[PDB]
Enzyme design. Sequence first.
Site, PDB file in Angstrom:
ATOM      1  N   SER A   1       0.795  -1.227   0.000  1.00 25.89           N
ATOM      2  CA  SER A   1       0.000   0.000   0.000  1.00 25.89           C
ATOM      3  C   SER A   1       0.831   1.283   0.000  1.00 25.89           C
ATOM      4  O   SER A   1       0.270   2.377  -0.042  1.00 25.89           O
ATOM      5  CB  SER A   1      -0.963   0.014   1.191  1.00 25.89           C
ATOM      6  OG  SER A   1      -1.915  -1.027   1.085  1.00 25.89           O
ATOM      7  N   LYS A  38       0.282   3.843  -2.766  1.00 25.42           N
ATOM      8  CA  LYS A  38      -0.855   4.761  -2.743  1.00 25.42           C
ATOM      9  C   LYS A  38      -0.432   6.224  -2.670  1.00 25.42           C
ATOM     10  O   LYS A  38      -1.187   7.110  -3.072  1.00 25.42           O
ATOM     11  CB  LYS A  38      -1.795   4.413  -1.587  1.00 25.42           C
ATOM     12  CG  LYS A  38      -2.536   3.104  -1.802  1.00 25.42           C
ATOM     13  CD  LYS A  38      -3.348   2.687  -0.592  1.00 25.42           C
ATOM     14  CE  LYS A  38      -3.889   1.278  -0.774  1.00 25.42           C
ATOM     15  NZ  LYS A  38      -4.795   0.854   0.328  1.00 25.42           N
ATOM     16  N   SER A  98      -6.297   3.322   4.562  1.00 23.47           N
ATOM     17  CA  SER A  98      -5.892   2.150   3.785  1.00 23.47           C
ATOM     18  C   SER A  98      -7.101   1.464   3.152  1.00 23.47           C
ATOM     19  O   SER A  98      -7.192   0.236   3.123  1.00 23.47           O
ATOM     20  CB  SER A  98      -5.106   1.165   4.656  1.00 23.47           C
ATOM     21  OG  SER A  98      -5.901   0.657   5.713  1.00 23.47           O
ATOM     22  N   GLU A 117      -5.604  -3.669  -5.947  1.00 20.58           N
ATOM     23  CA  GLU A 117      -5.785  -4.162  -4.590  1.00 20.58           C
ATOM     24  C   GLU A 117      -6.839  -5.270  -4.617  1.00 20.58           C
ATOM     25  O   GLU A 117      -7.852  -5.138  -5.303  1.00 20.58           O
ATOM     26  CB  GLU A 117      -6.237  -3.030  -3.668  1.00 20.58           C
ATOM     27  CG  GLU A 117      -5.171  -1.972  -3.406  1.00 20.58           C
ATOM     28  CD  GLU A 117      -4.130  -2.417  -2.396  1.00 20.58           C
ATOM     29  OE1 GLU A 117      -4.107  -3.613  -2.039  1.00 20.58           O
ATOM     30  OE2 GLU A 117      -3.333  -1.565  -1.955  1.00 20.58           O
ATOM     31  N   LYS A 169       3.208   6.446   5.067  1.00 19.24           N
ATOM     32  CA  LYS A 169       2.275   5.464   4.542  1.00 19.24           C
ATOM     33  C   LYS A 169       2.912   4.090   4.682  1.00 19.24           C
ATOM     34  O   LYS A 169       4.031   3.863   4.214  1.00 19.24           O
ATOM     35  CB  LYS A 169       1.957   5.745   3.074  1.00 19.24           C
ATOM     36  CG  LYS A 169       0.934   4.793   2.470  1.00 19.24           C
ATOM     37  CD  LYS A 169      -0.470   5.093   2.974  1.00 19.24           C
ATOM     38  CE  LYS A 169      -1.458   4.018   2.552  1.00 19.24           C
ATOM     39  NZ  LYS A 169      -1.408   2.825   3.442  1.00 19.24           N
ATOM     40  N   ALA A 219       1.429  -3.690   4.080  1.00 21.48           N
ATOM     41  CA  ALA A 219       1.588  -5.071   4.506  1.00 21.48           C
ATOM     42  C   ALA A 219       1.058  -5.981   3.411  1.00 21.48           C
ATOM     43  O   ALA A 219       0.106  -5.635   2.713  1.00 21.48           O
ATOM     44  CB  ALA A 219       0.851  -5.319   5.809  1.00 21.48           C
TER      45      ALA A 219
END
Length: 406
Positions: A188, A191, A248, A284, A352, A355
Amino acid sequence: DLGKKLLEAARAGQDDEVRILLANGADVNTADETGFTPLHLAAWEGHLGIVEVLLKNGADVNANDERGHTPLHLAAYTGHLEIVEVLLKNGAGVNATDVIGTAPLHLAAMWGYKEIVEVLLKAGADVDAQDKFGKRPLWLAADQGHAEIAAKLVAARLKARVGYIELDLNSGKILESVRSEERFPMMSTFKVLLAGAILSRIDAGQEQLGRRIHYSQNDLVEYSPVTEKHLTDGMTVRELASAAITMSDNTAANLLLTTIGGPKGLTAFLHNMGDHVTRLDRWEPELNEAIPNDERDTTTPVAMATTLRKLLTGELLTPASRQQLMDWMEADKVAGPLLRSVLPAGWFIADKSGAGERGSRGIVAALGPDGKPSRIVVIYTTGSQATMDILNEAIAMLGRAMIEKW
């Protein structure tokens, strides 16, 4: 008689006198009042030649003094690399502990002997050895600000690759680096790059923060903490950006990706601004799969760090969009356990985290003391089978080292 002679000859670095004394039947394993042997004293003083001659003549490589110190302990404490290697080669116990539980790795780590730490770990030193007072090598290294050593101990603890880099915001000078050129799954952390690409289209008048995005229940992916609550009225670009970075929200990330042409669109944005390394290939949550040796959805610490710096302080974005990007990252609320957990009071952090599978974990951050960011830090790891708590702790300890070295 000859024992006192051998002990002081060994200590004094008198190579020939040691040879003569042993040749005249001197006990190679003679001990002084506290249990020190000639080998102890030679290791302490850095007498490599004498260390080798003593062992050739059958010195006990693992002799203990009154307090349980071995020759390896003394060599580690004094930073005599070549002697450490000779002792290990001659059967020195790499995990020997003195009366208070101190192993050689505690000492090497504490005193910042990078190469000796490398040699000890490769020889099978227990990375999480805990002394009588609960102290571990990683903790000693972190409190001493030995960040490079800390990274090595983290990798050994996690049994995984660890990459990090730390650069100056004003100059771009790389200040710290370990495996900064190797590829890691972005997770992530991508992002923040997506956000930059959105803000770029906004600067161009091709997008608006207030433009409303309508989506369906079919677009929802694990997890959709914000987006799952606005299926009827939709959400603005602004709201999706905030949700993606700060909460997230994976669906929010995907929805914003679509507006720039998916993973290909972000990769094109990146290639165009000079990042020929960072690539996003999937949406995602599939992008977190972290398949070993899979280059999909990966970056390098330096590539991410450079790109991130260019978005935050470079000319890619307007001052307004630059600030908005920083603000979204400062208002991050799903990154408690990493750098924020070891950040001293009064410090600024905009970050940011990410995982994924196979112990994939990482963070990108702009941080600094006195309420202003002054450096970018990027940390990635992947491949570990450790629990989530241990990953978080390890990365936190790495940041604790950096803050100490700051």
